[PDB]
From a paper:
pmcMammalian [name] cytochrome c oxidase (CcO), the terminal oxidase of aerobic respiration, reduces molecular oxygen (O2) to water, coupled to proton pumping, providing charge separation (membrane potential) and proton gradient across the inner [name] membrane for ATP production by FoF1ATP synthase. The O2 reduction site of the enzyme contains two redox-active metal sites, Fea3 and CuB.
The nonperoxide oxygen atoms, OA and OB, were located at 1.76 Å from Fea3 and at 2.30 Å from CuB, respectively. The occupancy of the oxidized-type structure in the helix X region (residues 380–385), 0.90, is essentially identical to the total of the occupancies of the resting oxidized and E-forms, indicating that the water channel is closed in the E-form. Significant negative density at a region including OB of IO80 and the peroxide is consistent with a shorter (∼0.4 Å) CuB-OB distance of IO80 than that of IO20 and higher peroxide occupancy of IO80 than that of IO20 although positive electron density cages at the position of OB of IO20 are not clearly seen in this σ level. This Fo(IO20)-Fo(IO80) calculated with IO80 phases for monomer A indicates that the CuB-OB distance in IO20 is significantly longer than that in IO80 in the map, confirming a shift of the oxygen atom (OB) toward the CuB site upon the O to E transition. Upon this transition, the CuB-OB distance was shortened to 2.3 Å, which is close to the usual coordination distance. In fact, both the occupancy of OA and the Fea3-OA distance were not influenced upon the O-E transition. The simplest interpretation for this experimental result would be protonation of the OH− ligand of CuB (introduction of a positive charge to the ligand) upon reduction of CuB2+. The present assignment of the CuB site of the E-form as a Cu1+-H2O structure is consistent with X-ray structures of several organometallic compounds, each including a Cu1+-H2O coordination, in which the H2O ligation was determined by identification of the hydrogen atom positions. The CuB1+-H2O in the E-form completely blocked electron back-leak to Fea33+.
Author numbering:
A (entry chain H): 7 to 85
B (entry chain M): 1 to 43
C (entry chain B): 1 to 227
D (entry chain F): 1 to 94
E (entry chain C): 3 to 261
F (entry chain G): 1 to 84
G (entry chain L): 2 to 47
H (entry chain A): 1 to 514
C-alpha cells in the first residue's frame, strides 16, 4: 500500500533466468487493471504496482511496440 | 617391415629439388597475395 | 581487465567470482595430476627392455580405473554444483538495469524510477585519451552502486550478442525476444571491463562493456544528471 | 478368392540365387554361407578346408569366446598348424 | 570366380550422375531463391529423376533378371532399408521438436497462447480425421496385398495393391485441397511454419511412398515377384507403414493436441 | 487391447481382405460422409494486421513476391488485408 | 582387367617422379592457394 | 578404363583412395584458412579487414577441417580401405551407393567455396546461429550455399553410415561374431550409428533455417513466435555426437597402432574397449546443452548437463588406461606411427581434461565463448583426431600403395608438427582464462604476447604440412616396394599383400565354429 | 499379361561383356548419353552461374 518501491521483487512464479514472461505478465496486468478501472469510474492508482514492476523489468522497445500495437488494434494478448 | 631397395633412387640432390619445389608451391602464391594485401585493401 | 602475459583468471571482483577461482584451483590440480600421471605412465611403459606379450587379464584393474575416476568426478561435481546453486540463490536486488545488445554497441536502461537510457560505444583507437585502453573504453560507462545486489536483464534488438564481465564472473547471452537475468554485486569500487561474447557480425570485436562502480550517493546523482 | 499366377523361386530364380537354392536343397554350401564345424584338429583328423585354388586364408578362433582371430594362409600339401593353438588344418582343393 | 554369395556390382555411372544432380538441384534452388531463375533447378530435377530411374532399373536387372540377390544380399538390403527409415524418423523428429518447443512455450508475440491469436485451426474431426482413416485403411490393404503375394495369388495382390495406391492418392488429393482451403499459410508465424513444413515433408513422403508402390504394381504386373522373393514390395510396405505412423503422430500432435 | 473383433486361427490373405472390406473401407466411407457434410465455407474472420502473421522478411520467389504458394483469395489475406 | 600392383592402383601416374612432382605441386598447391585468392577476391570487391 | 575405374567405381579400395586424396586436398585448404586466422591475430591491429572477412575465414576453416578433411579421411578413407579387409569381406554391402557418398563431396565443397565467393561470404561461425545467419543480417546467397553444402555432406555421410552398418553386421565370416571383429571395425560401426541418428536432426534444423531465410517461416524468429535458441538445440543435438564421430575412428586406429608397435597380438581389455566406445556413443547424445550454458537455461537443467557430460570421462579413461596397458610389456617399435599414437594418448588426455573443466556450468560461464574452449577442442582435434590420422596414414601407407615411406623423414615430420601444435594451442589456455573472446579479428593489447606465440606456432605447423607433401612425393619417387610385414596373424588387412589385388576375398576366409 | 521374365533373364545374362546399365540395348546408351550430357552441361552452367554471382552487378 505505502510505497518505498526500489525495484521489482523476486516473484516465485518466475524464478529462472528467462524473465520474459515476468515482464509480459505485469504489462498485461497493468493494462487489464487500468481498463477495469477507467470503466467503472475508479482509480488507475490501484494498478500502480503492476505499472512499476513492468516499467522496471521490460525493455523500453518492448513496451513501446506493445503500446503501438494496442493503439493499432493488433496487440495479441487479451486485455 | 622389410622392403626392396628403391627401384628409382632419389638422391640427396633430387630430394633437395623436390623439397624446394614443394615448399615454393605453397609459399609463393600465398606470399604474393599477402605482399599485395595493402594494394587490395586500398583498392 | 586482463594485463600483459596473464596466465589465469582476472582477480575476482565479486564473491561468486572468488568462489569460481577456488573451484578452478581445485579442478586444475586434478587436471595437472591426471595429465602428469598419464605422461609418467607412458614414459614408464616405454623405458624397459623387459617384455610380457602373452594375454593379460583385464577384469581386476578395470575396477580401479573405473571407480577411481568416478570418485574424482564426484569430487569435482560436489563443489561445482554447490556454486551453481549458490549463483542461482534468491538475493533481493536493490536495483534493476537492462542492457540491449545491438550491432555494434550496447544500450542501457535504468527504469526503476525515471526513464534513463543511453548508448555505449567503443572509443575509437584514434580518439583514446592518453593511458586509455585500446578496444576496451566506451564513451558512456555503466555506472552502478558498489556493494549492492543488482539485477541485470539482458536482451538484444537485432542478432545474438553476449554481455560479459570476466572479473565479476558474468556472461549472459543477449537474445532478441528474450529477457535473461543475472545478478551482479561488486565488492569494490572501480572500472570493470568485458567484451561482446557472441559472434554478431562486422564489429563483434569492437563493442565492449565498462562498469563503473561507485558509492550509492554518487550513482544517484549521476543517474539524475543522465535524464 | 484364392487363385494362382505368382511364379515360385523354383520356377523363376536364376543366376547365383538359383545356384545357392539348388545347392542348399542338396545339403551343399559352395558359396560359404555356413560356418564349417571343427574336427578334433589333430594331425590324424585335421580340419578340412575346401578351396577352388591352392591356398586359402584360415582364421582360427583358438578357444571359445576369444576375441582375437589368428589368420594365416593354408597351402595345398601337408597339414599346417595354427601358430597360436597348433590345431591342424589341411587344404582340399577342388 | 567367387565362392561367397555377395554381389560385386558392375562399374556404374549413376553415383556420379546422382551426385551431380544434387549439385544442380541445390545450386538451382539458390538460383531460384536469389537470382529469379528456375533453369538449373529444372535440369537438376530432371537428371535426378533420370538417375533414380536408371539406378533402380539396374537393381531390377541385377536381381529379377540376373539372379544376384542371394539370401545374404537380400538380408543386407533389409538392414539398409531399416536404417534408411530410422534416419527418416530422426529427420521428422527435428520438426516435431520444433513444433513442441514453440507450442508448449508460446511467446508474447503469439499472444502468449497456443494456438496463436488470429490462428483458426482446421477441425481435426473433418478432413484430417478422414485422412487418418484413409492411411490406416491403406495399411490394412497393403497387408492384404502382402499375404496374397506370399500365398501366390496374383489377382488379389494386384487388387489390394491397387486399393492401397488409390488410398495414397486420395490422401494426397485431400491434403492438397486442405492446403488450398486453409485460412492460415506458411507465413503465419510459427503455427504456419510448423504446420506446413511438417505436414509438407510428410506429404512428400506419401508421394514418394505412393510412387514406390506404383513401381511395385507394374513389377507385379510383369511377374517380377515370386511368392518368396519380393524385397522391393517388402521395402515399399515398410516405408508405407512409416508414412502411416508419421501421419498418426502429426494428427495427434499438430492437428488435435495443437488445436 | 484385443480391440473387440476376434479371428486369427491363421492370419492370412483372406483375413486381411476381410478386414480391408469389412472394417477399413467402411470406416473411410463413414469419415467421407462425415466430412463431405461438414464442408461448406466458414465465415472468414475480420482482417486484423497482426505482426506475427502474414510474415514477409523476403519476397517469395514466385508471383509478385507477396502471395503464398497455395494462396486462396477467399480466406488468405495479404499483409494489407483481403484482396479484390 | 585393371592394372594391379604398386603405382597402378591410383588415379595418377608415378612413372616419372618429376612429372609426379609437378602434378602433386599443382594438386596440393592449388588447395593451399585457394583461400588466399578468395580473400583477395573479397578484398577487391569492396 | 580410367573413367570406368575412377569415376564409375564399385570398389572399396579405389573409393577409399578417392576419399584419402579428397581429404588431403581439403586439409591443404583448411591449413591455409588456419594460417589466415593466425596471420590476422599474429600482431595487434587489423590485417585483412573487419570481423566479416575474418569470420568467413574462421567459419570455412572449421567446415573444411571437419566435413572435408577429418570425416572423409577417417570414415570414407580408412573405413572403406580397411573395414572390408579386416572382416574378410569382398567389398561393401552397397558398392555402388558407396561411390555416390564419395562423389557428393566435391559438389558439397564447391558449394562451400561458392558461399565464400558470392556477396560477403557466410561469416556466421560453423554453428550458423540465427539471427546473424538469417536473411536480414546475412542477406543474399552465401548462407544458403553453406546450408546446401551441409545438406550434401549430410546425405553423403548418412548413406555411408547405412553402408558401414550393413557391411559390418551382415558381411563377416559366418563364424565371426561381433565380439571377434577388430576394434577399428567397432569404432566405424559406432561412428556410423551416431551419423545415422544425428545428421537427420541437423538436416531438419538447417532446413528450418533455409525456410526462415527464403519461405517466410519463423521457426527461429521471435516476431513469428519462433526462438533462436531452438536452432541451437537442434544444431547441438547433432554437434555433440559429431565430435564423437570425429574421434571414434581415431580411437579405433590408435588401438590398432598401439597394439601393432607394442608387438602385441591384441589390445588390452578388448571387451572393455568395446564397452567404452558404445558408452561414449550413447552418452554423446544426452549432453548437447553443455554448448548452451550461457543462454539462460534453468539451474536444474544446468546441473543435469554438467553431470551427464562429466560421466563420459569414465569410459574414456578406460580406453586411455587400456592403451597404456597395451604398451605394458611390449617389444616397443619406435616407428613414426607409434610416435603419433603416443602423442595422441597424452595430448588427447589433456584436451579431454579441459573439456571436463568446461563441463562445469558454473566455471563455463566465464570460459564459454573464449579461447579456453578453442584450446580444449584443438587439443582433441589438432592433437587427437589429426594425430590418429597421421599415425594411421604412416602405418597403412605401405598397405595402400605397396611402397615405404622414409622413416627418418616421417619422424622429423612428427617432431616439427608436435612442436608446432603445442606452441599454437597451449598459450590459448591463458588467453581463455584471462578473457579473450572467440571469433575476434583483434584483441586488447594485454593479449598480445600469447597471440604472437600462438601465431608463430601455426607457422611451424605449416612447415610440417609442406614437409608431409614432400615425404609422400619422396616415397612415390623412390619406389621402395614392401616385402614382409610382421604380425599378419593378427592384422588381416595385410595378409593379401601390398597393395592387395583389386578383388580380395573372392574366396572367403575359412573360419570354423568348433 | 504373360510372364516374359525368362526372356529378360536370357537377355541380361548374355555373355557379351556389357555392364548392366547398357545391357538392355541401344536405348540404354541413348538414355545414358542424355543423362550424362545434362549432368556435365548443367554442371558447367552452374560454374558459369557461380562466376556470374561472384561479382557485384550494378
Ligand atoms: C524425365 C524423367 C525421366 C524418368 C525416366 C524415363 C525413361 C523412359 C524410358 C522408356 C523406355 C518395370 O516397371 C517400371 C514401373 C515404373 C513406375 C513409375 C511410377 C512413376 C511415378 C508416378 C507417380 C504418381 C504418384 C503420386 C501419388 C499422388 C498422386 C496425386 C495426383 C524397369 O522398367 C525398371 C525401371 C523403373 C524402376 C525405377 C523407378 C524409379 C522411379 C522414380 C523416378 C521418378 C520419380 C518420380 C517420383 C516423383 C513424383 C512423380 C518402361 C518404363 C518407362 C517410364 C518410367 C517413368 C518414370 C518416371
Ligand atoms: C602440454 C603452466 C603455467 C601455469 O602456471 O598455469 C597456471 C594457471 C593459472 O595460475 C594462476 O593464476 C597463478 C599463476 C602463477 C604465476 C607464476 C609465474 C609463472 C611463470 C610464467 C610461465 C610461462 C608460461 C609458458 C608458456 C608456454 C608456451 C608454449 O594457468 C593455467 O591453468 C593454464 C591452464 C592449462 C591447463 C592444461 C593442463 C595441461 C597439463 C599438462 C602437463 C603435464 C606434464 C607437463 C610436462 C609437459 C611435457 C610434454
Ligand atoms: C574430437 C573432438 C572433441 C572431443 C572428443 C571432445 C570431448 C569432450 N568435450 Fe568438447 N568440444 C569440441 C570437440 C571435442 N570435444 C568442440 C569442437 C567444441 C566447440 C564447439 C564450438 O563451439 O565450436 C567443444 C566444446 C565443448 C564444450 C562447450 C564449452 C563452451 O562452448 O563453453 C564442453 C563443455 O562441457 C565440452 C566438454 C567435453 C568433454 C567433457 C569431452 C569428453 O569427451 C572428454 C573425456 C576425456 C577425458 C576426461 C580424458 C581421458 C580420461 C582419463 C585419463 C580418465 C580420468 C579423468 C578424469 C577423472 C576426469 N566440449
Ligand atoms: C578438425 C578440426 C580442426 C583442426 C584440425 C583445426 C586446426 C587448426 N586450427 Fe582450428 N578450428 C576448428 C577446427 C579445427 N581446427 C573449429 C571447429 C573452429 C571453431 C570455428 C568457429 O568458431 O565457428 C576452429 C577455430 C580456430 C581458431 C579460433 C578462431 C576464432 O575464434 O576467432 C583458431 C585460431 O588460432 C584456429 C587455428 C587452427 C590452427 C592454427 C590449426 C592447425 O593446427 C592446422 C595445422 C594443419 C593440419 C593439422 C593439417 C591438416 C591436414 C591433414 C591432416 C591432411 C593430411 C594429409 C594426408 C593424410 C594425406 N582454429
Ligand atoms: C500433399 C499435398 C502437399 C504435398 C507436398 C507439397 C509440397 C511438398 C514440397 C516439399 C515439402 C518440403 C518442404 C518444403 C517447405 C515448404 C513446403 C511446405 C508444404 C507446402 O506446400 O506449404 C505450402 C507453401 O509452400 C511454399 O512456401 C513453397 C513450396 C515449394 C518450395 C520448396 C523449397 C525447397 C525446400 C528445400 C528442401 C531441403 C531438403 C533437404 C533434405 C535433406 C535430408 C538429408 C503452403 O501453402 P500456403 O499458400 O503457404 O498456405 C496455404 C494457404 N491456403
Ligand atoms: C527426456 C526427453 C523428454 C521430452 C519431453 C519433455 C517435455 C516437457 C514439457 C512438459 C509439459 C509442460 C518448454 C520445453 O519445451 C520442449 O519443447 C521440449 C521438446 C522436446 C526435446 C526433447 C529432446 C530429445 C529429441 C530427440 C528425440 C520450455
Ligand atoms: C525426391 C524424389 C523421390 C521420388 C520417388 C522415389 C520412389 C522410390 C522408388 C524405388 C524403386 C526401387 C525399385 C527397385 C527395387 O525394388 O529393387 C529390389 C531391391 O530393393 C531395393 O533395392 C530397395 C531400394 C529402394 C529404397 C527407396 C526408398 C525411398 C527413397 C526416396 C528418397 C528419399 C527422399 C527423402 C526426402 C526428405 C529388387 O529386389 P526384389 O524386389 O526382391 O526383386 C527380385 C526378385 O524379382 C527375384 O525373384
Ligand atoms: C536441398 C536438396 C538436397 C538434395 C540432395 C539429394 C542428394 C542425393 C541425390 C540422390 C540421387 C539418388 C539416386 C538413387 C540412389 C539409390 C540408392 C540405392 O538404392 O542403394 C541400394 C542400397 O541402399 C539401400 O538399400 C537403402 C538406402 C536407400 C537410399 C535411397 C536414396 C536416398 C537419397 C536421399 C537420402 C536423404 C536422407 C534423408 C533423411 C535425413 C542398393 O545399393 P547399390 O550399391 O546401388 O546396389 C547393391 C546391389 O547389390 C543391388 O542389386
Ligand atoms: C601464410 C602463408 C605464406 C607464408 C609466407 C610466404 C613467404 C613468402 C615467400 C615469398 O613470396 C614472394 O615474396 C616476394 C617478396 O619477397 C614477392 O615479390 C614481390 O616483391 C618483390 C620484391 O620487392 C618484387 O620483386 C616482386 O615483383 C613482387 O611481386 C612475391 O610476389 C611472392 O611470391
Ligand atoms: C556451382 C555453385 C553455383 C553457385 C550458384 C549461385 C546461383 C547462381 C544463379 C545465377 O545465374 C545468373 O543470374 C543472372 C540474373 O538473373 C543472369 C545470368 O545469366 C545467370 O547465369
Ligand atoms: C559383461 C561385459 C562383457 C564380458 C564378456 O562377455 O566378455 C563386460 C565388458 C566390459 C565390462 C565393464 C568395464 O570393464 C567397465 C566397468 C568395470 C567395473 O569393474 C565393473 C563395471 C564395468 C561397467 C564392467 C561391467 C562388465 O564386466 C562389462 C560390461
Ligand atoms: C533441453 C530440453 C528442451 C529443449 C527445448 O527447449 O526445445 C529439455 C526438455 C526435457 C528436459 C529434461 C526433462 O525435463 C527431465 C529432467 C528435468 C531436470 O530438472 C533437469 C534434467 C532433465 C533431464 C531435463 C533437461 C532439459 O531441460 C530437457 C532435456
Ligand atoms: Cu555483439 Cu559480438
Ligand atoms: O562437443 O564437445
Ligand atoms: Cu559437446
Ligand atoms: Mg556463446
Ligand atoms: Na514378404
Ligand atoms: Na588482427
Ligand atoms: Zn588357433
Amino acid at each position: 500500500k505505502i510505497k518505498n518501491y526500489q525495484t521489482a521483487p523476486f516473484d516465485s512464479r518466475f524464478p529462472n533466468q528467462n524473465q520474459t514472461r515476468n515482464c509480459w505478465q505485469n504489462y498485461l496486468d497493468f493494462h487489464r487493471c487500468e481498463k477495469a478501472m477507467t470503466a467503472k469510474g475508479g482509480d488507475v492508482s490501484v494498478c500502480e504496482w503492476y505499472r512499476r514492476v513492468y516499467k522496471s523489468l521490460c525493455p523500453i522497445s518492448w513496451v513501446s511496440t506493445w503500446d503501438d500495437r494496442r493503439a493499432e488494434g493488433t496487440f495479441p494478448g487479451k486485455i | 617391415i622389410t622392403a626392396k631397395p628403391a627401384k628409382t633412387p632419389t638422391s640427396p640432390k633430387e630430394q633437395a629439388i623436390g623439397l624446394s619445389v614443394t615448399f615454393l608451391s605453397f609459399l609463393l602464391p600465398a606470399g604474393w597475395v599477402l605482399y599485395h594485401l595493402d594494394n587490395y585493401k586500398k583498392s | 581487465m586482463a594485463y600483459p602475459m596473464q596466465l589465469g583468471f582476472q582477480d575476482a571482483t565479486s564473491p561468486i567470482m572468488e568462489e569460481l577461482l577456488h573451484f578452478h584451483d581445485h579442478t586444475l590440480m586434478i587436471v595437472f595430476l591426471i595429465s602428469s600421471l598419464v605422461l609418467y605412465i607412458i614414459s614408464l611403459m616405454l623405458t624397459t627392455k623387459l617384455t610380457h606379450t602373452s594375454t593379460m587379464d583385464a577384469q581386476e584393474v578395470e575396477t580401479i580405473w573405473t571407480i577411481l575416476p568416478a570418485i574424482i568426478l564426484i569430487l569435482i561435481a560436489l563443489p561445482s554444483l554447490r556454486i551453481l546453486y549458490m549463483m542461482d540463490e534468491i538475493n533481493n536486488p536493490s536495483l534493476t538495469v537492462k542492457t540491449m545488445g545491438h550491432q555494434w554497441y550496447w544500450s542501457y536502461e535504468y527504469t526503476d524510477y525515471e526513464d534513463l537510457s543511453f548508448d555505449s560505444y567503443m572509443i575509437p583507437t584514434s580518439e583514446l585519451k592518453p593511458g586509455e585502453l585500446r578496444l576496451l573504453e566506451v564513451d558512456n560507462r555503466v555506472v552502478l552502486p558498489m556493494e549492492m545486489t543488482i539485477r541485470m536483464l539482458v536482451s538484444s534488438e537485432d542478432v545474438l550478442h553476449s554481455w560479459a564481465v570476466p572479473s565479476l564472473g558474468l556472461k549472459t547471452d543477449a537474445i532478441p525476444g528474450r529477457l535473461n537475468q543475472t545478478t551482479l554485486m561488486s565488492s569494490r569500487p572501480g572500472l570493470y571491463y568485458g567484451q561482446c561474447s557472441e559472434i554478431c557480425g562486422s564489429n563483434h570485436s569492437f563493442m565492449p562493456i565498462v562498469l563503473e562502480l561507485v558509492p550509492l550517493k554518487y550513482f544517484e546523482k549521476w543517474s539524475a544528471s543522465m535524464l | 478368392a484364392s487363385g494362382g499366377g505368382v511364379p515360385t523361386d523354383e520356377e523363376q530364380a536364376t543366376g547365383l540365387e538359383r545356384e545357392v537354392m539348388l545347392a542348399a536343397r542338396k545339403g551343399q554350401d559352395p558359396y560359404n554361407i555356413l560356418a564349417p564345424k571343427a574336427t578334433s584338429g589333430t594331425k590324424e583328423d585335421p580340419n578340412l578346408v575346401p578351396s577352388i585354388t591352392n591356398k586359402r586364408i584360415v582364421g582360427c578362433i583358438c578357444e571359445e569366446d576369444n576375441s582375437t582371430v589368428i589368420w594365416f594362409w593354408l597351402h595345398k600339401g601337408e597339414a599346417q598348424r595354427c601358430p597360436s593353438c597348433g590345431t591342424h588344418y589341411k587344404l582340399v582343393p577342388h | 570366380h567367387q565362392t561367397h554369395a555377395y554381389h560385386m556390382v558392375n562399374p556404374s555411372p549413376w553415383p556420379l550422375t546422382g551426385a551431380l544432380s544434387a549439385l544442380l538441384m541445390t545450386s538451382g534452388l539458390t538460383m531460384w531463391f536469389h537470382f529469379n531463375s528456375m533453369t538449373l533447378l529444372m535440369i537438376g530435377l530432371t537428371t535426378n529423376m533420370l538417375t533414380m530411374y536408371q539406378w533402380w532399373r539396374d537393381v531390377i536387372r541385377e536381381s529379377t533378371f540376373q539372379g544376384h540377390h542371394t539370401p545374404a544380399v537380400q538380408k543386407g538390403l533389409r538392414y539398409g532399408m531399416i536404417l534408411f527409415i530410422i534416419s527418416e524418423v530422426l529427420f521428422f523428429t527435428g520438426f516435431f521438436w520444433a513444433f513442441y518447443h514453440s507450442s508448449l512455450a508460446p511467446t508474447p508475440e503469439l499472444g502468449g497462447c497456443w494456438p496463436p491469436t488470429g490462428i483458426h485451426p482446421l477441425n481435426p474431426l473433418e478432413v484430417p480425421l478422414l485422412n487418418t482413416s484413409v492411411l490406416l485403411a491403406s495399411g490394412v490393404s497393403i497387408t492384404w496385398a502382402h499375404h496374397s503375394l506370399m500365398e501366390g495369388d496374383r489377382k488379389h495382390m494386384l487388387q489390394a495393391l491397387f486399393i492401397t495406391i488409390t488410398l495414397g492418392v486420395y490422401f494426397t488429393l485431400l491434403q492438397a485441397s486442405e492446403y488450398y482451403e486453409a485460412p492460415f499459410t506458411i507465413s503465419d508465424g510459427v503455427y504456419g511454419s510448423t504446420f506446413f513444413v511438417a505436414t509438407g515433408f510428410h506429404g512428400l513422403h506419401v508421394i514418394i511412398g505412393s510412387t514406390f508402390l506404383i513401381v511395385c504394381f507394374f513389377r507385379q504386373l510383369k511377374f517380377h515377384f515370386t511368392s518368396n522373393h519380393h524385397f522391393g514390395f517388402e521395402a515399399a510396405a515398410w516405408y508405407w507403414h512409416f508414412v502411416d505412423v508419421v501421419w498418426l503422430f502429426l494428427y495427434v500432435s499438430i492437428y488435435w493436441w495443437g488445436s | 487391447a484385443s480391440a473387440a473383433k476376434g479371428d486369427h486361427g491363421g492370419t492370412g490373405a483372406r483375413t486381411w481382405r476381410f478386414l480391408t472390406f469389412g472394417l477399413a473401407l467402411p470406416s473411410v466411407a463413414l469419415c467421407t460422409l462425415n466430412s463431405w457434410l461438414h464442408s461448406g465455407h466458414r465465415e472468414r474472420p475480420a482482417f486484423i494486421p497482426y505482426h506475427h502473421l502474414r510474415i514477409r522478411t523476403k519476397p517469395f520467389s514466385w508471383g509478385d513476391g507477396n502471395h503464398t504458394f497455395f494462396h486462396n483469395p477467399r480466406v488468405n489475406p495479404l499483409p494489407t488485408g483481403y484482396e479484390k | 582387367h585393371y592394372e594391379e600392383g604398386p603405382g597402378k592402383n591410383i588415379p595418377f601416374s608415378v612413372e616419372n617422379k618429376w612429372r609426379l612432382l609437378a602434378m602433386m605441386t599443382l594438386f596440393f598447391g592449388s588447395g593451399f592457394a585457394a583461400p588466399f585468392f578468395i580473400v583477395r577476391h573479397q578484398l577487391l570487391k569492396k | 578404363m580410367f573413367i570406368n575405374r575412377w569415376l564409375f567405381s564399385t570398389n572399396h579400395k579405389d573409393i577409399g583412395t578417392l576419399y584419402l586424396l579428397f581429404g588431403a586436398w581439403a586439409g591443404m585448404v583448411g591449413t591455409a584458412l588456419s594460417l589466415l586466422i593466425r596471420a590476422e591475430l599474429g600482431q595487434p591491429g587489423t590485417l585483412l579487414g573487419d570481423d566479416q572477412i575474418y569470420n568467413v575465414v574462421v567459419t570455412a576453416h572449421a567446415f573444411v577441417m571437419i566435413f572435408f578433411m577429418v570425416m572423409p579421411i577417417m570414415i570414407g578413407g580408412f573405413g572403406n580401405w580397411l573395414v572390408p579387409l579386416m572382416i574378410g569381406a569382398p567389398d561393401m554391402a552397397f558398392p555402388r551407393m558407396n561411390n555416390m557418398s564419395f562423389w557428393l563431396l566435391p559438389p558439397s565443397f564447391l558449394l562451400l567455396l561458392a558461399s565464400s565467393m558470392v556477396e560477403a561470404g557466410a561469416g556466421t561461425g560453423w554453428t550458423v546461429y540465427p539471427p546473424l545467419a538469417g536473411n536480414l543480417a546475412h542477406a543474399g546467397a552465401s548462407v544458403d550455399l553453406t546450408i546446401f553444402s551441409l545438406h550434401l555432406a549430410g546425405v553423403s555421410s548418412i548413406l555411408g553410415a547405412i553402408n558401414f552398418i550393413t557391411t559390418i553386421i551382415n558381411m563377416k565370416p559366418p563364424a565371426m561374431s561381433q565380439y571377434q571383429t577388430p576394434l577399428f571395425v567397432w569404432s566405424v560401426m559406432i561412428t556410423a550409428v551416431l551419423l545415422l541418428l544425428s545428421l537427420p536432426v541437423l538436416a531438419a534444423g538447417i532446413t528450418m533455417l533455409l525456410t526462415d531465410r527464403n519461405l517466410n517461416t519463423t521457426f527461429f524468429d521471435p516476431a513469428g513466435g519462433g526462438d533462436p535458441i531452438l536452432y541451437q538445440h537442434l544444431f547441438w543435438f547433432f554437434g555433440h555426437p559429431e565430435v564423437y564421430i570425429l574421434i571414434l575412428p581415431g580411437f579405433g586406429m590408435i588401438s590398432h597402432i598401439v597394439t601393432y608397435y607394442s608387438g602385441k597380438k591384441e589390445p588390452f581389455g578388448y571387451m572393455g574397449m568395446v564397452w567404452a566406445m558404445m558408452s561414449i556413443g550413447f552418452l554423446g547424445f544426452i549432453v548437447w546443452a553443455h554448448h548452451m550454458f550461457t543462454v539462460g537455461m534453468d539451474v536444474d537443467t544446468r546441473a543435469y548437463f554438467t553431470s551427464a557430460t562429466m560421466i563420459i570421462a569414465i569410459p574414456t579413461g578406460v580406453k586411455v588406461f587400456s592403451w597404456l596397458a597395451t604398451l605394458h610389456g611390449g617389444n616397443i617399435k619406435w616407428s613414426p606411427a607409434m610416435m603419433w599414437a603416443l602423442g595422441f594418448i597424452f595430448l588427447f588426455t589433456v584436451g579431454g581434461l579441459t573439456g571436463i573443466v568446461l563441463a562445469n556450468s558454473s566455471l563455463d560461464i566465464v570460459l564459454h565463448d573464449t579461447y579456453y574452449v578453442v584450446a580444449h577442442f584443438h587439443y582433441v582435434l589438432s592433437m587427437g583426431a589429426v594425430f590418429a590420422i597421421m599415425g594411421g596414414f604412416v602405418h597403412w601407407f605401405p598397405l595402400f600403395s605397396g611402397y615405404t615411406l622414409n622413416d627418418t623423414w616421417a619422424k622429423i615430420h612428427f617432431a616439427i608438427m608436435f612442436v608446432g601444435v603445442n606452441m599454437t594451442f597451449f598459450p590459448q589456455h591463458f588467453l581463455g582464462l584471462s578473457g579473450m573472446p572467440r571469433r575476434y579479428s583483434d584483441y586488447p593489447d594485454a593479449y598480445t604476447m600469447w597471440n604472437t606465440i600462438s601465431s608463430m606456432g601455426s607457422f611451424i605447423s605449416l612447415t610440417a604440412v609442406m614437409l608431409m607433401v614432400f615425404i609422400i612425393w619422396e616415397a612415390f619417387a623412390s619406389k621402395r616396394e614392401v616385402l614382409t610385414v610382421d604380425l599378419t596373424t593378427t592384422n588381416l588387412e595385410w595378409l593379401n599383400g601390398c597393395p592387395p589385388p583389386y578383388h580380395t576375398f573372392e574366396e572367403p576366409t575359412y573360419v570354423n565354429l568348433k | 499379361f504373360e510372364n516374359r521374365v525368362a526372356e529378360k533373364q536370357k537377355l541380361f545374362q548374355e555373355d557379351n561383356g556389357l555392364p548392366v546399365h547398357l545391357k538392355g540395348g541401344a536405348t540404354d546408351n541413348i538414355l545414358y548419353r542424355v543423362t550424362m550430357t545434362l549432368c556435365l552441361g548443367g554442371t558447367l552452367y552452374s560454374l558459369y552461374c557461380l562466376g556470374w554471382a561472384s561479382f557485384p552487378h550494378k
